[PDB]
Automatic annotation (TrEMBL):
Stretches with biased composition (Basic and acidic residues): 218-229
One GO term describing the cellular component: preribosome, small subunit precursor
PANTHER family xrefs: NNP-1 PROTEIN NOVEL NUCLEAR PROTEIN 1 NOP52, RIBOSOMAL RNA PROCESSING 1B
Source taxon at top rank: Eukaryota
Name of the protein: Ribosomal RNA-processing protein 1
InterPro entries according to UniProt: RRP1
Organism placement in taxonomy: Eukaryota, Fungi, Dikarya, Ascomycota, Pezizomycotina
Location relative to the cell: Nucleus
Organism the protein comes from: Chaetomium thermophilum (strain DSM 1495 / CBS 144.50 / IMI 039719)
The family this protein is said to belong to: Belongs to the RRP1 family.
Length: 232
């Protein structure tokens, strides 16, 4: 197993220990062969540490910077490791969702927003303006977690993680924001219209299959957005 001695310091009560530990994590991910070999268990340990780094961050502007810093970690990785990295994020947030106290809930809602936003941005071609293989990995994770027709996800001694309804509801009312932010609501480009339509298909399938009246009514809200082409 990899040695990651900085993880236990990400949650330290000393702010400078936390920053130094996070900087060590930055350095750890920059070693290209190490980042290329990241396992599911590796990223689960790293995202658990990052979760508690945000948990310990107490002020609004540091919280916003930290959410941007954590979302930007996606660019530090070789492309073959991004899917595993993001998978570790959603599995971590799914495990922790219901346990987050009220005072700390908002910054984690922001973290999900920034991580999802950076995921959409990472689909853009620097690897037709959209990379289909990257699109399919980001959209595949939407289908695997917030928009899944299943109740749980099997990871890897199987790890089975239930999908908390709060994760679905949060993604349902932010996903249009974040595709708009990266230019996917541009009607003149065919790839973008297809990507938006594909996500809408997933939400609509969730709406017609869920046993949850709340998921069903919030899926309708999500799909009724003024900004989507079908409503204009």
């Amino acid at each position: 197993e990899k040695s990651m001695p900085f993880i236990k310091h990400l949650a330290s009560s000393d702010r400078k220990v936390r920053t130094a530990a996070l900087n060590s994590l930055h350095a750890f991910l920059s070693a290209r062969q190490v980042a290329s070999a990241l396992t599911t268990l590796d990223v689960l340990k790293l995202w658990k540490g990052l979760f508690y780094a945000l948990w310990m961050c107490d002020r609004a502007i540091p919280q916003q910077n930290l959410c941007n810093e954590l979302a930007d970690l996606i660019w530090q990785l070789p492309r073959e490791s991004v899917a595993t990295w993001l998978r570790g994020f959603w599995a971590t947030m799914a495990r922790e969702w219901t346990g987050i106290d009220v005072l700390r809930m908002e910054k984690f809602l922001l973290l999900v927003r920034r991580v999802l936003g950076a995921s959409f941005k990472w689909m853009k071609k620097d690897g037709g303006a959209w990379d289909q293989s990257k699109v399919d990995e980001v959209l595949g994770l939407l289908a695997e977690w917030p928009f899944s027709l299943a109740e749980e996800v099997r990871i890897t001694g199987e790890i089975v993680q239930k999908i908390p309804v709060g994760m679905r509801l949060h993604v349902l009312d932010i996903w249009v924001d974040e595709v708009e932010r990266v230019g996917l609501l541009n009607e003149d480009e065919e790839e973008a219209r297809m990507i938006v339509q594909r996500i809408s298909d997933m939400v609509d399938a969730l709406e017609q299959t869920t046993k949850s009246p709340a998921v069903r009514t919030r899926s309708k809200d999500s799909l009724g957005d003024d900004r989507l082409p079908a409503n204009r």
